Amino acid sequence: STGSATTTPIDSLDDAYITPVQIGTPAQTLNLDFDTGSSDLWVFSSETTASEVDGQTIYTPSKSTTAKLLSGATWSISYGDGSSSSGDVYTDTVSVGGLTVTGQAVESAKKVSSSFTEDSTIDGLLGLAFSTLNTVSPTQQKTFFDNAKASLDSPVFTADLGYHAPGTYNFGFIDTTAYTGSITYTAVSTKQGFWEWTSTGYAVGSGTFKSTSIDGIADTGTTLLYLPATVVSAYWAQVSGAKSSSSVGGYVFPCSATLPSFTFGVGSARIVIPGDYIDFGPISTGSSSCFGGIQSSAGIGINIFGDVALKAAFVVFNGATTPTLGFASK
């Protein structure tokens, strides 16, 4: 089997991407944030505290003939941005792009933090990291990908995120029309439950490539590119008037600037992030200070190749017995 679904930016900055997902029978379509940095499939639901719902589409298990309570199971998750959610668990039929899993754990939110409530466009998350991070207790549950894997034509999914445009998530096949050149594969460590890999270095603009190992995760659920402070300082030093602002919470730059590109290494291959991908626009409406898309990871504990980096590539998440990541230009 295969699946193919279009993923759409939630706003003009590409802050996140939503993908329609069918849950239950008859189908209830919710728009979920596919997150390669977490492992829970959770939704706004008929159980979510009413004051915490503001425009999201909800899953109502009582209207699904295939829903079953997963008795006794609860979940609770906290993300890197400080957001959180928790609840109980149903199993139900879930389809993405024509690929169906029966018996998928659908984590029904009873509580969500303010950042979720305030984002009316995101109806929940679909985690695609390794199932070792799934938070369901007392019986940990599998991701949609892990449940689909054995049925897929190839045990892979691909992320092809757009810059200010829709893109695609494919399951079970690699669309050889979707990228240019060849795919460079690199090793993955699953020790922390993430798609963790080591970049071979970086360049700023037309500068020389610096060979240096940068361990980090491929995380579709993170907007920006978070890298070591040395690398980030080297990038923003090439932008007149850029500075790190403790008041704003990262590097800002004059909105009048033209940003240089950023290149990262994948083995001997190179992915180039155009400068415009690094512009996240005014820090507040009408400001002439703009927020940078490359930020320090110093306060995180891990480097994160988020959407700024991933949308410059066609990315293969190879879930074979020995997982690997692949990157191609596009």
UniProtKB/Swiss-Prot annotation:
Molecular function GO labels: aspartic-type endopeptidase activity
UniProt keyword annotations, A-Z: Aspartyl protease, Disulfide bond, Hydrolase, Protease, Signal, Zymogen
Gene Ontology biological-process entries: proteolysis
Residues of the Peptidase A1 domain: 17-328
Catalytic activity: Hydrolysis of proteins with specificity similar to that of pepsin A, prefers hydrophobic residues at P1 and P1', but does not cleave 14-Ala-|-Leu-15 in the B chain of insulin or Z-Glu-Tyr. Clots milk
EC number: 3.4.23.22
Keyword Disulfide bond in annotation: yes
Disulfide bridge map: C255-C290
Coiled coil (residue ranges): none
Active site (record annotation): D35, S199
Organism domain of life: Eukaryota
Family in the record: Belongs to the peptidase A1 family.
Name by which UniProt lists this protein: Endothiapepsin
Shown residues within the full chain: 90 to 419 of 419
